[PDB]
């Protein structure tokens, strides 16, 4: 009852996310035949940009027929996939689909002005910007829980060294590749190697240095940490992706020819021509996959899949890390201790608890993973498959993540954030600023 | 704990070492979340030291 | 040929072979009065089952009859795949509209 | 009035059911036109998911054409046939349509929560834990009144 | 009421134990704060279904 | 020819060689039976390697049985060009419909 008042002092005109986009947002974190597809494309188009710009029509018409079964905002977990719809699916987007795109960003920008407007105008001090030794999400001592590049990674390790920064990804210290192909598959080796796979073309392609700018990880950690935890009230977790069957069940193609006399179809009834009609909807294909979320696609959309035949990825890891105090609050009495943050390298969060499907067994592709306290779901972690009995009644109280992972005491945020989540009622506007009203270091 | 092994079994090496862990008393800071703030001040946890 | 105003008459392969479109009709033209000088050696309730053993194969039937205008139905969940073992198993939500031009 | 405002002592925001998906239901109710073919598919379907899922598309030609004669929510009387339609039939009814089973799913699902807001955490009694003897519905001593 | 015929047995419940509490959620407290008291369960002659 | 009840079978060769319409159902037609007598060289994750190998083989095999019906595509992003220093370098959003009459 003390936070949500003191949310308030942020909403005194800051920016307001309109009630028409906020349902919009709210049935995607309750939809149950959430289609499963974009789970999978959210695997393949996995934060690149090469990737995107050629998937622009399926992508495009897999928002548009899911406008017209649910009106629900697509692919909200990922804010790389929230981002390059803003940047560049413009104009075929209607007009009123556009509007929840904009409040989900526009609405970012305005939570990053919460620190610019609350620090004074100091100079460095341990190396590292004024801004940063304020507010948490600033600081490059945490990292975002989902990560398809290092570039939260590059800019950790330019640190000064009174501040231990290293990164412990499963044992191995992080050796970092250039890109993943068709025979650099691998898929289950086991040295510390991640990815820079996503970048703006093929020749724009370093690993000295990080691609992207400085603010662009800041935009994530304020969108995992405050946008996602404020709508799905602890009914979230993060999950580890099996790659093998991604690429494999995306290329399960089949492509009917077109006679050169005819026309392209669009009727997923009517015409035998298209790749949704009965008579080319073969079992386990890709196809297949399509008509189980009722998603209308276009004949020749389908021929684009063929840039995940360059563009690959390896693996999901475990990324734990240690982390010393900061620069103005390091005291010879605190130089003892570390804090400990978890992420993940390219997972993909999951929104609602698909266990009553029946058309996809368990522990096919998403193995889930509670990274953080905020992100453990009570219906996800029970209903992997191997779940001792015993727990059942104890996995609904208290979350459950391993300390493979980070625990309470030794990470960033503890506990009652969680709490704090659940018994408010300030509603999808002031918690988004309340939230930031606890981010603020002591 | 460090992390070992790919993470696919990393959730199973959990449940099946820490299922006897996970039930011997009160976790302390669960239990905080269903506290009065009057409660709190009360000798009635052993959480105040 | 069954009698429907007679118990001890009906069989499977007396409903199988009559047509489910000439089943419908012959129970619709019986008597009204029912016979009571020989009844079914199960009892009336054994008729009872006795009869719903012809209509389910005589609609088996009439799905053969509309083979030439429907699809091969695929299987509908998971775990049913011969090749397992590198791609997984899907299953068709049938919602669709079988029908052969 | 006491039990009704010890009712509203839990509407503290953590759920309420929308306006439009009660007079769709409060019609559900009080229809003396319920066809019984909404009855007489609920003894063949009878809780299976085999059954159901080869019958996805009968189910929905039935809560499409009533969904457009009357406007109410079909086959309401079974959960289990409640949480199969939202589960599987997605794509198939309108818009509209689908925010009525939701929430009818999702506001029971808010019900569950009730319990466990309300429970300290402790130790096992009775081959029970702790949670469980607190509620009523959390008892397996209960049976709901129609079981498939 | 089984997913598929391979996973048939009768040792077992097959469905969570969650589902269950769903369902004595629905019909203690959903039906009758709708029906006022107006519906009744019944017995289904399943010979002329 | 493959047999995908046998991991020892599967090369890029035997899956290129047959078309994409011919992959799927020849996967689809196997046997539940996994052999175990002859495993593959590189172990069965080798396999899954080996077998991702042939479809991105294909799918560039099926796109140039489109190639009398879509167009030649151009460059996305810019800083690709071979006319730069007078002229410089947009890039074409693919979001047309390419097809040929």
Known sequence: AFRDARGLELGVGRHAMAPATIAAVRGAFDDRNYPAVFYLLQAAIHGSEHVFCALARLVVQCITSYWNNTRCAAFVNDYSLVSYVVTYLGGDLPEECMAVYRDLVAHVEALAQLVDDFTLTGPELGGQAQAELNHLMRDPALLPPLVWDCDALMRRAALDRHRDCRVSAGGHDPVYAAACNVATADFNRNDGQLLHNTQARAADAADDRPHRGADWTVHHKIYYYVMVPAFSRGRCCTAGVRFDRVYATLQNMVVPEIAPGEECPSDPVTDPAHPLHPANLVANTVNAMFHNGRVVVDGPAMLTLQVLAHNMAERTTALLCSAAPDAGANTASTTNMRIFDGALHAGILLMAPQHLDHTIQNGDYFYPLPVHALFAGADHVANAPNFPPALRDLSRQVPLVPPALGANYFSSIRQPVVQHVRESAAGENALTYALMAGYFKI | ?49 | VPQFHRPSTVTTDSVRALGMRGLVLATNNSQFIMDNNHPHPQGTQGAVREFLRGQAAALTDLGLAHANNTFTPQPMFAGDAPAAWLRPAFGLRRTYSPFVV
């Open chain 2, 1 to 49: 704990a460090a992390p070992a092994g790919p993470a696919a079994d990393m959730q199973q090496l959990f449940l099946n070492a820490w299922g006897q862990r996970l039930a011997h008393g009160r976790v302390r800071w669960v239990a905080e979340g269903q506290m009065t703030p009057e409660q709190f001040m009360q000798p009635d946890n052993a959480n105040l030291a």
